[PDB]
Design a protein around this ligand. Structure first.
Ligand SMILES: OC[C@H]1O[C@H](O[C@H]2O[C@H](CO)[C@@H](O)[C@H](O)[C@H]2O)[C@H](O)[C@@H](O)[C@@H]1O
Ligand SMILES: OC[C@H]1O[C@H](O[C@H]2O[C@H](CO)[C@@H](O)[C@H](O)[C@H]2O)[C@H](O)[C@@H](O)[C@@H]1O
Lengths: 142, 142
C-alpha cells in the first residue's frame, strides 16, 4: 500500500477514499478549476466520492469558484503521475495517465512544484478539504 | 514500471539498470561530484552497476572531474525524492530517502530543476552517459 507524502496544509477536514476504492479502478476525474483547483471528486468503478472541496457557495469570498472539468477514463487507463503545486493549500494539479496527458486544473502554478510518480497507477486519494483542497495524498497500486 | 520523464540531453550512450535491479533494492549510491555530477553508480542488493559517466580521464578537457561520494543505505532505506537540475546534461542530483536527506552532488544548481517524488522508493535508474551524465530517468517499483 504505497502512498505519496501529504501535499498541502492542515486546514479543512480529513477525507480518505480508501474504502470506496474497493469498488475498483478509478474511472473518472471531476474537478473544479479556476486559477486554483477548488475541488476534486474521483469515481471508483461506478461510484463517486463526495465532492472534496468547495464546501459551500459563500466560499466565493476567499477564492474564485471555477469550471467543472471532467475526464472520463477509458478501460485500462490509469493515472501514473501528477504535477502538484502547493503550499498552505493545493494550488494546481496536472494528471498524466498511461494513455494521455491531461490539462492542468488551476491556471496558477507559482507555488512549489512537485512531480509525483504513482507506481502501478493511482488507486485512490486522501487529503483534506473545505472551501478548497487543503491537501492531497496519492495512494498507489503498489 | 512507472517511470519519470527523461531529464537531460541526447548525447552519450543509453544505459538501463532494469535487469540489474532484479538483484535487489538499492543498497548504495555512488557519484562523482564537482560543480556538476559526472557519474552515477548504484548497487542493487549486492550487485554493482557499471560506472555511468566519466568514461575516461581525458574527459577533463570538457568538465571538471570531482570526488567520489559514497552513501550506503540501511536495510529498509529507499530513495523517495530526487531533485535534478539539468539541460544538455544532468548538472546536479539531490537524493532524499525515507530516513534522511543526502547532500547534493553538483555544487551548481542553476539549470532547470524538477523534484521527482517516488512513493515506495526508487527501484532503478536509466539514462545516457559518456564523459558525464547526459540524462537520467527514474523508475518506481510498480
Ligand atoms: O468559513 C470561514 C472560512 O472559510 C474558509 O475556511 C475553510 O476552508 C479552508 C480551505 O479549504 C480550510 O482551510 C478551513 O479550515 C475552512 O474553515 C476560508 O479559507 C477561511 O479564510 C474562512 O475563515
Ligand atoms: O570523446 C571526446 C568527446 O568527449 C565528450 O563527449 C562524450 O561525453 C559527452 C557527455 O557525456 C556525450 O554527450 C558525448 O556523446 C560523448 O562523446 C565531449 O562532450 C565531446 O566534446 C568530445 O568530442
Amino acid at each position: 500500500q504505497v502512498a505519496s507524502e501529504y501535499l498541502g496544509g492542515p486546514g479543512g477536514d480529513a477525507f480518505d477514499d480508501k474504502a470506496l476504492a474497493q469498488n475498483g479502478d478509478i474511472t473518472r476525474i471531476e474537478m473544479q478549476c479556476t486559477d486554483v483547483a477548488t475541488y476534486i471528486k474521483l469515481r471508483y468503478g461506478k461510484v463517486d466520492s463526495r465532492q472534496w472541496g468547495w464546501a459551500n457557495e459563500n466560499c466565493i469570498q476567499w477564492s474564485k469558484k471555477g469550471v467543472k472539468v471532467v475526464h472520463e477514463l477509458s478501460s485500462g487507463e490509469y493515472i501514473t503521475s501528477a504535477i502538484v503545486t502547493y503550499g498552505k493549500y493545493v494550488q494546481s494539479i496536472t494528471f498524466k495517465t498511461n494513455k494521455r496527458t491531461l490539462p492542468r486544473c488551476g491556471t496558477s502554478a507559482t507555488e512549489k512544484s512537485v512531480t509525483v510518480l504513482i507506481p502501478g497507477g493511482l488507486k485512490y486519494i486522501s487529503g483534506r478539504w473545505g472551501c478548497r483542497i487543503d491537501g492531497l495524498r496519492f495512494h498507489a497500486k503498489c
